[PDB]
Structure 1
C-alpha cells in the first residue's frame, strides 16, 4: 500500500519559524480578486455563477445569464475593492492578492494600483472555476496562460499559486512548472512546509490557506450572521495562536473577497480585528512571498 496523503506532517514537533521582529504570530491577510473571471456564458462557460454571493441559495443557470449574480460581483470590482485597499493602506498592512488572470485583464487599473501600493500579486488561476473534472492538458494550458497574463500586467511573473477548487492534478502541475516559490492549495497545517512529493526535486514551499478564517462564510449555509461573529472568530484564532507563540509561533491566514468584506456592514468587523491585532506587540504583518523567502533563509530544504 502506497498511501499518497501525509496525515502526520511535523507530528508533535513543529519547527520554530523564527519570524522577523521576534514575532509570536505571523498574519497573512489575503484579498481575492475574482470579479470578472467567474462563471458566465459571456466568458464561454456553460452556466452562470452560483458560489459566494448574497444569493445564498443560488444555483447555476444552464445557458443563461443571472443578472442579479452579475451585479453582486460588480459591487466587488466597482466599490468594495477601493474600500478594502484604503483600509489596509490606513493601517500600513501589506496584502497578498490571489488574482484571477481573466479578472485582472478586465480591470488592469486596479491591479496596477495594487502593484504600486506594494501588494504581492499571486496567481489565482486563469479562470475562477472548479477544476475537478478538467483534463490535465487543458488545466496545464490555463496555468501557463495565467502566468503569461499576470506577468504582462504586473511586470513580473507570479511566484505563488492558489486555485481553490482544485482537481486531482492541480498541485502536481503547479509544482511541475518549476517557476513558483510556493502554493497555498492546502488547509492542512498552521505552518509552511516543504512539499514531500516534488519530483522536479527543486524545493517547493507549501503555505497552507484557510476556509474557516475566511469571509466566504458570510455567504455559506454555515456562516457568520453579523460582522462581530467574524471578528470574534478571528480574535479567538489569534488569541490561541499568540498564546502558543510564547514558545512555538505559527501563522494565521485571513481570506477576503472584494464583493463580500467590501460591503460596509462587513468591513467594520475587519477593521476591529486589524485594530485588535495591531494592539499587540510581536505580530508580523506580512505577504505570502515574504513568508516563502523567510522560510528559504531560515529552514532551507534538505
Structure 2
C-alpha cells in the first residue's frame, strides 16, 4: 500500500522578500519584481493550481497580505490554506525575542482577519530558527512548521533544547571535542524544508547575494525534482513530498511549464494524494501521537 502525500507550499516573498532577505530595499527595480510576484505571480499560480484542481498552502508575509489585498481574496476564495511567514520576511535569528514575537503576533492577527481562522502553519523567512519552537507553540494555532531539515520525506516532532560545542581555537581541543546533545521532543510537527525542493535559490537572480544563482535550467531542476519523487515512490509506502515555490519564480512561464511536467508525472502514479500542509500535520498527528 502506497500513501504519497503531495503538496505545494507557496512562500509569497514578493516585496517583503526584497526588504528582509534579498537586499532589494534600496532598489526600485527589485521592488518592481516584488510587485510582479503579487500582482502577476499569484493569479498565474492560482490558474495553474485550478487547472489540475490542486489544493495548496500559501505562507504569506504580513507585508504581502496588506500589499496585495485583492490577490489575497483570490487565494482564500479558492479554498486554499493560508499560513504565516513573517511580516517583511525578516530573518528571525537577526531579531530580538520581542521583535520576533511581535512579528508573529501581527501575522496571526492579519491572517485571522483575512481567513476567519487563526493560522496553523509557519515558514521561517529564509529558513532560519532561534527560539521559534517555543514561540510557535506559545502563539497557539501553530500546529506545524515547514522550515527545518532534520529529515526528508517524513514528518517528525521538533526537539527543543539541542546543544553543541562551538570550536574556539583560542582554547584547547578537549573544550570542543564533545558530541551534539539532543534535546526534548515538542508537539510542533515538522513538515521539513528542503533546498533540493526549493525553486528560488537555483532560479532567481540576486545581485546583492554572493551565493545567488538564477540561471540554472528549469528542465534540469524539474527533472531533479522528478527523480526525487520517483525514488521516494519506489522506496517508501508512506511519505510526504512537499515542494517550496514562490510566485516570484514559479509563476514565470518557463518554470510554470516545469510544474506542469512535474504535476503530470506525479499524477501518473497511484497512491498519490494532493493535500494542504495542515492536512499533513493532521494526518501525521493521527498517524503517530506522542
TM-score normalised by length of structure 1: 0.79
User: Which position in structure 2 is the counterpart of 1:282?
Assistant: 271
User: Which position in structure 2 is the counterpart of 1:159?
Assistant: 120
Q: Equivalents in 2 of 1:292, 1:111: separation in Å?
A: 23
Equivalent pairs counted in the alignment come to: 260
User: Which position in structure 1 is the counterpart of 2:15?
Assistant: 36
Q: Equivalents in 2 of 1:250, 1:155: separation in Å?
A: 31
User: Which position in structure 2 is the counterpart of 1:4?
Assistant: none
User: Which position in structure 2 is the counterpart of 1:179?
Assistant: 141
- 3-state SS of paired residue (1:26): strand
User: Which position in structure 1 is the counterpart of 2:247?
Assistant: 258
Q: Does 1:137 align with 2:98?
A: yes
Question: Is the contact made by 2:57 and 2:82 (CA closer than 8 Å) also made in structure 1?
Answer: yes
- 3-state SS of paired residue (1:89): helix
Please report how far the alpha carbon of residue 174 of structure 1 lies from its aligned counterpart in structure 2 after TM superposition: 1.5
Please report how far the alpha carbon of residue 128 of structure 1 lies from its aligned counterpart in structure 2 after TM superposition: 0.8
Unaligned stretches of 5+ residues in structure 1: 1-21, 41-48, 52-59
Equivalent residue runs for 1:141-290 within 5 Å: 141-165=102-126, 166-189=128-151, 190-197=153-160, 203-216=187-200, 217-219=202-204, 221=212, 225-245=216-236, 248-290=237-279
Unaligned stretches of 5+ residues in structure 2: 162-182, 205-210
Higher helix fraction (1 or 2): 2
TM-score normalised by length of structure 2: 0.82
Question: Is the contact made by 1:98 and 1:123 (CA closer than 8 Å) also made in structure 2?
Answer: yes
Q: Equivalents in 1 of 2:215, 2:33: separation in Å?
A: 19
Structure 1 stretch 159-168 or stretch 195-204: which is displaced more? Answer: 195-204
Please report how far the alpha carbon of residue 150 of structure 1 lies from its aligned counterpart in structure 2 after TM superposition: 0.8
Q: Equivalents in 2 of 1:98, 1:128: separation in Å?
A: 11
Q: Equivalents in 2 of 1:132, 1:143: separation in Å?
A: 14
Equivalent residue runs for 1:46-195 within 5 Å: 51=22, 60=23, 65-165=26-126, 166-189=128-151, 190-195=153-158
Structure 1 stretch 228-237 or stretch 192-201: which is displaced more? Answer: 192-201
Please report how far the alpha carbon of residue 162 of structure 1 lies from its aligned counterpart in structure 2 after TM superposition: 1.1
Cα RMSD (Å): 2.3
Please report how far the alpha carbon of residue 194 of structure 1 lies from its aligned counterpart in structure 2 after TM superposition: 2.1
Please report how far the alpha carbon of residue 197 of structure 1 lies from its aligned counterpart in structure 2 after TM superposition: 3.1
Please report how far the alpha carbon of residue 82 of structure 1 lies from its aligned counterpart in structure 2 after TM superposition: 1.1
Q: Equivalents in 2 of 1:236, 1:79: separation in Å?
A: 30
Question: Is the contact made by 2:16 and 2:34 (CA closer than 8 Å) also made in structure 1?
Answer: no
Please report how far the alpha carbon of residue 81 of structure 1 lies from its aligned counterpart in structure 2 after TM superposition: 1.5
